[PDB]
Amino acid sequence: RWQEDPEPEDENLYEKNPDSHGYDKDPAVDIWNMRVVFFFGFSIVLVLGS
Amino acid sequence: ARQWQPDVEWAEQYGGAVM
Amino acid sequence: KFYIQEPPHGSPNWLKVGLTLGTSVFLWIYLIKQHNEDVLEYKRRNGL
Amino acid sequence: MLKYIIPTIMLMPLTWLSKNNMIWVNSTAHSLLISFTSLLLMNQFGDNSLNFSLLFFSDSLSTPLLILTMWLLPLMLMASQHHLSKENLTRKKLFITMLISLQLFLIMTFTAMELILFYILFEATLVPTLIIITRWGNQTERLNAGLYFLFYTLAGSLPLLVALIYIQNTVGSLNFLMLQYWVQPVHNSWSNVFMWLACMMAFMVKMPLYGLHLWLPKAHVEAPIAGSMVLAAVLLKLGGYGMLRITLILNPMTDFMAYPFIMLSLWGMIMTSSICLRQTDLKSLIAYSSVSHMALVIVAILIQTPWSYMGATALMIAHGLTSSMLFCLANSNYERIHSRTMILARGLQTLLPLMATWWLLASLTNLALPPTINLIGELFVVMSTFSWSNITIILMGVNMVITALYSLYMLIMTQRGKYTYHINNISPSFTRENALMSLHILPLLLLTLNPKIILGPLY
Amino acid sequence: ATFQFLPDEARSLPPPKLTDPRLAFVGFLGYCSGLIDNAIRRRPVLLAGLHRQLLYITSFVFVGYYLLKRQDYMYAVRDHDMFSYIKSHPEDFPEKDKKTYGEVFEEFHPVR
Amino acid sequence: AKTVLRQYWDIPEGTECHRKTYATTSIGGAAGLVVSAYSVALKTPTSFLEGVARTGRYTFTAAAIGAIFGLTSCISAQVREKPDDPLNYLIGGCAGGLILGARTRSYGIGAAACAYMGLTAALVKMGQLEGWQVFAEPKV
Amino acid sequence: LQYGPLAYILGEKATKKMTEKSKLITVDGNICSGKSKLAKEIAEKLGLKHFPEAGIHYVDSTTGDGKPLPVQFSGNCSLEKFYDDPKSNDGNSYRLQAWLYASRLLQYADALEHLLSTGQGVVLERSIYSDFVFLEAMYRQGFIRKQCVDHYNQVKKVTICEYLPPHVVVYVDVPVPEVQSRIQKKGNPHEMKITSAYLQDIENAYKGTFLPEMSEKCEVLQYSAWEAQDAEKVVEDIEYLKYDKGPWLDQNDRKLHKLRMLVQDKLEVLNYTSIPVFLPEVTVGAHQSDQVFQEFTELPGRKYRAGYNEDVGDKWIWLK
Amino acid sequence: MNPIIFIIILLTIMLGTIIVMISSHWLLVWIGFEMNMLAIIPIMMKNHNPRATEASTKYFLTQSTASMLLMMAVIINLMFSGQWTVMKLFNPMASMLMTMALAMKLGMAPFHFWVPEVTQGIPLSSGLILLTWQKLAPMSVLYQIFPSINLNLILTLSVLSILIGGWGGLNQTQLRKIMAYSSIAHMGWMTAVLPYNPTMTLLNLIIYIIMTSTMFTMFMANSTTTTLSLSHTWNKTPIMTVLILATLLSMGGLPPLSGFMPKWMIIQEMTKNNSIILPTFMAITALLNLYFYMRLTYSTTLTMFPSTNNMKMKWQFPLMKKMTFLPTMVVLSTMMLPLTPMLSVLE
Ligand SMILES: CCCCCCCCCCCCCCCCCC(=O)OC[C@H](COP(=O)(O)OCCN)OC(=O)CCCCCCCCCCCCCCCCC
């Protein structure tokens, strides 16, 4: 019992950006966040670390 | 699902003279 | 935006800005001057 | 260790001075770079540990724990950035700051030479962990969970502080290198019985020991995903790491003081495995699986054999990657259906075929399929426990049977059968989620090629 | 000397290096106070009033230099007092003859 | 207090259990009176009789715990011929907790009282044997 | 120097600035009674500062650039909505009156501060002393609940006690039937919904409680509809008042210093207007509160303290 | 109150404390206490209401009684030593009376009943003086007479203060009464170590004063005196809630914050003296303090309580309070642990 903002809707990241990688709503930032994870996570740490 | 935050019923637990 | 009232800190208080910067400058000079004497007296007392 | 401490501290300015929309990109990219350089700690010698300075040293016990810690930070950032999308910007930067400061305390905890420096950082990890659970948890019960977490830990930690300080008065130093040469035997007496309990009960609560574990399922059900990842992957292993260090100065009293705790562990692992068969909450199930796995680690440390410590080290690393992966998998389901009930969403292999592969791989490691490092650790503990007393093979064997039962039960309940008709918001797995799972499993399986680097100082 | 922050004899000790890591930490505390001062008063935290932020670093460093100087002196005094006492009472601090582990007997506790 | 505690401590354990009960009943009775005095002072009774009635209950209850502990602990020492055993006091401490539960007519309190009083009593015996100091004399 | 104990010590004392013309005047009356016209004309003739009646956006007019802010930053309370549906489920009726009292409380503090610091009198249209007449009118009509009145009286008790009442209480008497007619001539569709019982309750409160109470502590001048029309004849009455009653006779520089300290600190003035009493009509949930507060700091010139926002032209921030 | 009169009285509160701390004569120590009491009563009565009058009366009766036992101890000491020098007393009855006199002045249990009531009944700024500056003079006396203090008496007062301070705070919602029971609990730590290392009594006193001033200054900043009003701070000054959280965690004695330093150093000095049971008991009982500090953090910083509509009017006005030294104090309350060895300056 008070003044409240209702429960917000779930936002499907795919509807606005069908090519979303799930990192960010902005497509350009979403591409960069994918490249750093893959390049540093896989190409550097796992391949050169191994 | 929105994060739960204290409501009036929860907050009134701390409004009394004692706990 | 362009405030309806004059803000209490609308412009710098150049007296405090003068005293603040001067006090920092004074203290730094005093500290290094003190550190010089301390080292020189230390070397003097220790034979260095 | 400055080459790891200083860059970790620099992550804080990087996040705060990063452009508004680059906080997750910048922190993720540079925390991965720090994880890369952490491999330089593998300069380990057969006889002498790697002793950098009066403050920090690194041996083959701390090194794999350090690498697991610095690897976990970028993984935690990826897992958190979706449920924090609507968070206020400055509150985003504070969430990342709590995780960075947790890494800072953890890498210094695992490399402190002296036990009081270890104690202070061992305890400093509470503040960020408590803040993450209570500030960014989701439900009402996150406030109770924070309190049980805080006071279970401190009720054991405070006696440990007294015991450590008393040891320095009598021995003259708490430096771990010094203790190796000045260690004296502990004779029978009630004063020593309570010194033994004071030194060990803080670490027992962290493992956690069966009986003192009821805080852990509370914290896991209430923590945000990143909280659950670090809590399961690394924070549990603070207790094991401390035990492997402090038992050095507790001999031979450990010979008989360990009996009550081995019985709790050996029987406790059977009880907690069986509880997993009847859990309704997917996160609680995975929480109760950690208690079962860490029961093996407690037994291995307490029997003090070269094989048991080698098995103990491998389990802590293997468990860390597996439990963190399981929490991430369950969280990905939660982010869709917004519920932790295991029976709510069924038959997901039909709708998310590649995420069912990750579910399968995580389950296979969890039940210790050979030659995963999950089994190398489990097998070494069973080998040594058999020589401790042959009958233990019965309890050990039963636990493996039950361990497979609930591991595949969870896989069958959530991934197989018929899908739930009315749940119609199961979106295709995001590239972020798929990469998150692979960055768990791929290192875990890669380590089977070179298992020596995770076997510890007694290899 | 009574009610002296730094007695005269402290001058025969080497003064703390201005690059002392503890001093560098004290300067960092001063900087953190300056940022907090901007925050509670809702000013731009990093930029607002650099003249004020500067006096914070200086005052913390200035005060912290002399606290560190007295800290070092008080530990030097402690050691001086302790070593002198050991010299005044040789019979309470005898030099034992150290055996080698080849001679000293220690019980073996098997781990079975 | 020192005198009564000394008498209990300065007689051999497990011998002359009727005396020990005198000492532990006196300690218990005294503690009950101290509680009565503060309770009566800080929580004024409605009448003189209520104030005396409250004092009687607290003093009886505290003294009853004192007698039972000093009796249960000593009888077990002679029975088991283990005079220097903390286990004796654990039984003696628990028996006290049960009485507190009956006088308070609460199994939960009686169950909790046993655990805390039994373990507290067992620790006191260990302290005596090992020389543990509560209020340690300054030494360094 | 900002005002404070040091400035008071050095000579800044209210008795220096004040004179026989340092008076606080309040014009009251029913709706459409001619207050604003009269108050504005009194102020010019006597050379006093005029504060128009404190509306929903009074606070906006004293901070920032002075323009009204979007209504979500005043809680969405609306006068028009009150006339359309005074019995609304959303509690707009009491949220408005609670907001309006706080606005009046802030205007009174500003009015007092102007008088003390410069010595010039002020003219106000209604005040915290007469604001209760709207509360009673709302309650009698069943527009608000008994709990809301209890809350109002709690807030009023711990805030009005700190201040001094007006020297002069000008009141304009216009009976309800004329007030009715004067509303339609205004042509605001929302006001015309006002019932006469509501206007009668307002009149009864003024003549039942306000005027009798203020007579013991202030000078009260009552005027009819036509009497009020000649502002010059109203000023003439003010200029020859005796001023021989009320708490202003007991004020000395020690007391006025303490009073001036309160009114220059607006967060101390408004301290108790937000007491943690959880009425539905004035309670805001965490998510709504947090979301709106984020928007407020995104308004031009609002992120930082005034004088440190360089998105609106502030300079030398690195030396301030 | 006239501003010049307020300054003169405030300087007389300090003058009386200084006299106690520089006096070598018992009579002058007693005079310093009377002067301090005479000047603090008008600061309690400043706002003139029935609660301030009650608090001032209860304070006067307690302080006036304690001063009378102090003078009795001094005269007994003169009888059995023929001198007035401030030092170890020469009569065990004198030591007991002086020790009880100083325990009453400090508000240590079981003489603690006045602290929660007096603190609640006076304004925040007066409570700040009461719980910080007023601890200096009685502690400076204890620092000088500890050789003759009865060990059982002083350690019993320490134990009772920690228990009663810990338990009393659990039931409170008023901030001034939470700070009072926090004060009682912290006094027990200062006196617990006094028989063993007086330097650690000073260390604990200093850090307690810093943290207590930091909390009171932040309560004064938003004019909050209850839990619920304090819970509105997140919707006014979010930064102030983070400072409160950090300071409260420090008062609770959590590493790696400053407030862990006194508990750490006191435990060290007690274990050197083969005192294991007492410091273990003290640390565990201090968990009571951490519990009712943690509740304040939950309702202040780690959750967001319901606000009120009128709160929006406050968004448009800057903080105007002086908040003197708050930036420096909050940093000292939290980030001092790396500089712990600096405690030897107090030696
Ligand atoms: C070599 C140094 C490494 C750094 C180590 C930091 C250690 C903690 C230091 C504590 C003091 C932190 C500064 C005090 C808070 C002031 C900053 C703030 O409140 O908000 C962030 C603020 C930006 O927000 P805004 O209000 O818009 O100001 C505009 C200026 N850009 O201003 C900013 O944009 C950035 C200002 C710094 C942000 C501080 C973030 C919080 C730090 C405290 C969390 C705990 C620290 C980690 C604990 C482990 C200790 C190493």
Ligand SMILES: CCCCCCCCCCCCCCCCCC(=O)OC[C@H](COP(=O)(O)OCCN)OC(=O)CCCCCCCCCCCCCCCCC
């Ligand atoms: C324990 C080991 C670690 C070491 C601990 C060290 C702690 C002790 C160190 C000293 C702590 C106090 C230092 C605070 C520095 C901030 C003062 C400042 O920058 O003020 C700037 C200016 C007013 O300063 P201003 O009066 O102009 O200075 C000239 C004096 N003739 O503009 C302003 O308006 C400032 C407003 C904010 C100031 C906070 C409110 C207090 C008022 C302070 C007045 C100035 C104090 C000058 C301190 C100089 C000390 C050398």
Ligand SMILES: CCCCCCCCCCCCCCCCCC(=O)OC[C@H](COP(=O)(O)OCCN)OC(=O)CCCCCCCCCCCCCCCCC
């Ligand atoms: C160095 C060796 C010693 C190491 C010891 C540890 C050092 C810790 C020192 C702590 C000193 C306090 C400095 C904390 C600075 C935190 C920065 C901060 O306050 O956040 C910025 C923001 C300020 O808000 P505002 O200025 O009003 O502007 C609008 C922005 N909302 O504030 C906010 O809006 C945030 C609102 C949400 C609140 C979230 C609370 C959870 C985060 C808590 C982090 C701080 C925890 C400190 C405790 C110790 C941590 C180790």
Ligand SMILES: CCCCCCCCCCCCO[C@@H]1O[C@H](CO)[C@@H](O[C@H]2O[C@H](CO)[C@@H](O)[C@H](O)[C@H]2O)[C@H](O)[C@H]1O
């Ligand atoms: C050894 C250390 C190595 C560290 C490596 C760190 C890798 C970080 C990769 C992030 C690269 C992003 O680089 C980006 O480039 C352009 C400038 O050309 C900037 O500006 C860009 O912003 C948007 C993104 O919203 C772009 O769509 C747009 O093309 C451009 O305006 C961005 O602000 C910057 O973020």
Ligand SMILES: CCCCCCCCCCCCO[C@@H]1O[C@H](CO)[C@@H](O[C@H]2O[C@H](CO)[C@@H](O)[C@H](O)[C@H]2O)[C@H](O)[C@H]1O
């Ligand atoms: C999870 C909780 C686990 C609890 C585990 C409990 C372990 C029980 C250990 C029992 C042995 C304790 O330690 C025991 O103490 C006493 C010291 O007083 C020693 O015995 C010594 O003192 C006792 C005094 O009563 C004498 O009887 C004996 O002559 C003397 O040698 C024993 O040699 C030692 O064995």
Ligand SMILES: CCCCCCCCCCCCO[C@@H]1O[C@H](CO)[C@@H](O[C@H]2O[C@H](CO)[C@@H](O)[C@H](O)[C@H]2O)[C@H](O)[C@H]1O
């Ligand atoms: C709160 C109520 C306060 C009421 C105060 C009541 C008056 C207090 C009187 C204090 C003086 C008592 O005097 C007490 O008796 C005799 C005095 O020769 C002393 O007697 C004791 O000490 C002296 C040592 O020289 C010797 O006599 C002997 O070793 C021993 O009997 C005590 O050491 C002393 O403490």
Ligand SMILES: Nc1nc2c(ncn2[C@@H]2O[C@H](COP(=O)(O)OP(=O)(O)OP(=O)(O)O)[C@@H](O)[C@H]2O)c(=O)[nH]1
């Ligand atoms: N509910 C409520 N309405 C108010 C309050 N103050 C003003 N109003 C309304 O604001 C409107 C304009 O104010 P009024 O002065 O009374 O009406 P007017 O047309 O301007 O007539 P004048 O007195 O000459 O200025 C009226 O419809 C009032 O009902 C208040 O405190 N509560």
Ligand SMILES: N=C(N)NC(=N)NCCc1ccc(I)c(Cl)c1
């Ligand atoms: N424990 C006591 N009662 N006295 C005390 N505080 N120190 C006594 C010993 C000591 C310790 C540190 C230093 I530096 C110095 Cl010079 C002397």
Ligand SMILES: [Mg+2]
């Ligand atoms: Mg009008």
